[PDB]
Assembly symmetry: C2
Homo-oligomer: 280 residues x 2
């Protein structure tokens, strides 16, 4: 429950109201965000997550108010406000307060910032199940998909609602071509014949920072990782399925519709490799 938010030059505790009833971002959707993690005393790829927040802001027509180093430095300061050995979820946020002459389009100079830190214990994942969804990923021509932006997630939400209705935690999501992109909440991986396969980045989903780190570590450990075009059929044949993302880094997928799947060895190795590097 413990929470600290940096807003208007001050660290503030608890619930901090940051968006106004007449803020452009509030009803016209310009807010972007990212996510880093403090756990077991370390903050892996905090620098990369800090940098992407600025990228996402610019991708949404905002003008980021802090350098990547500023955000990282501020994050580390905020973490100090927590009790020792407290795991924290770090969410930087940019948004426009005003619109330009068109009202709908953001006035870049009106960009504001907030950094929200929430105490969330880092727990070993028990894994989750997946099913298909009737909805698909958008693409750049119809949504700003090249950004970690709030406006993209109601799509993810309805997919999750659908999955939940069907008795599953999450959904395996395809792009408009019918090729697997990711889950409704995170990048997806599969293991087949001792090899790791993951959807090739094509811009319809975020090429996750955790994803890249895991690929890098797996290949360094001698594991073959293929970034290629994957279909639903490929995941039907998987020996293992897992996901990567900021909150828990590496999470097993223990069910795909009627096929139950074990928490696999290669997934466990991936997670082990991440933790080694994080504490190196």
């Amino acid at each position: 429950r413990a929470m600290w938010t940096y807003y208007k030059g001050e660290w503030r505790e608890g619930d901090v109201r940051i968006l106004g009833a007449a803020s452009q971002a509030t009803w016209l959707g310009s807010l972007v965000f990212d996510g880093a993690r403090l756990f077991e005393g370390v903050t892996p790829d905090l620098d990369r997550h800090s940098a992407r927040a600025n990228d996402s802001a610019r991708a949404l027509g905002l003008e980021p108010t802090l350098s990547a180093n500023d955000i990282e430095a501020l994050a580390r300061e905020g973490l100090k406000k927590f009790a020792p050995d407290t795991d924290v979820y770090i969410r930087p946020m940019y948004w426009a307060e005003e619109g330009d002459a068109s009202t709908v389009a953001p006035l870049a100079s009106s960009t504001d910032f907030a950094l929200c830190l929430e105490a969330i214990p880092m727990v070993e994942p028990k894994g989750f199940t997946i099913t298909t969804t009737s909805f698909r990923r958008p693409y750049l021509e119809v949504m700003p998909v090249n950004a970690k932006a709030a406006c993209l997630y109601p799509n993810n939400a309805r997919m999750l609602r659908e999955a939940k209705a069907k008795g599953f935690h999450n959904a395996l999501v395809t792009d408009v071509l019918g090729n697997v992109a990711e889950t409704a909440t995170s990048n997806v991986f599969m293991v087949r014949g001792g090899e790791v396969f993951t959807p090739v980045p094509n811009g319809t989903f975020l090429n996750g920072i955790t994803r890249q780190r895991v690929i890098k570590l797996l290949r360094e450990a001698g594991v073959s990782v293929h970034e290629t075009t994957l279909k639903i059929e490929d995941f039907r044949e998987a020996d293992e399925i897992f996901s990567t993302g900021n909150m828990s880094k590496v999470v097993p997928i223990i069910g795909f519709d009627e096929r139950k799947l074990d928490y696999g060895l290669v997934t466990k190795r991936a997670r082990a490799l991440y933790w080694e590097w994080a504490h190196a």
Copy 2:
């Protein structure tokens, strides 16, 4: 600058911060809104706009807290707080404060409400110009487009930015099939041979409340109105082009790229007919 906002059972003037740093809606995009208008002492179709706010909410997985009559009554109470002869933009808003077990999907029971009234002068339009845009309308398969939702507008923002880059106010927007849908901010109409043509609803754009009113009134005045598929070429050859929407109701489009167009006679009839009905 004058503003009155109803939030947590209380009216407050000026800037009211309604969305929290950790509100689900803030970084996951679940806020919906509508827009009605007070001008010259009347609030045409306030009831329809109030009702659609609940529709959009359910379309975003929210559970609206107020009936349409409740929303309208509140608006009428708030409007009394403004100085006489003040034109007001009326914006009801729904959003989720919490997410469910998935974090990303909104917890319907955590739906909250705010009604923001902004004094915005109703100006007699001189008309605006349009150009084409590289971006397209999304569709139901890839976004929850069946709602007046904040998450749908950063796409429109890109359209406006692109239009501004080419030296025009607004964009004439097509769906993925390549057919004209609307403008980046409002429904579009054209006039040809004394007949009115407007894009047929196909789910890629909002069937505006103003749009429906103008169609109804024109037909009652003996004007032929066609809801058909229109291409860019149709607007290239149009005798008149105009737009409808809550903000200014009926507005002429006086330019399509290099081609200037007059504020046409049928457009003037539409606006006159709207104002007549509005003051009835």
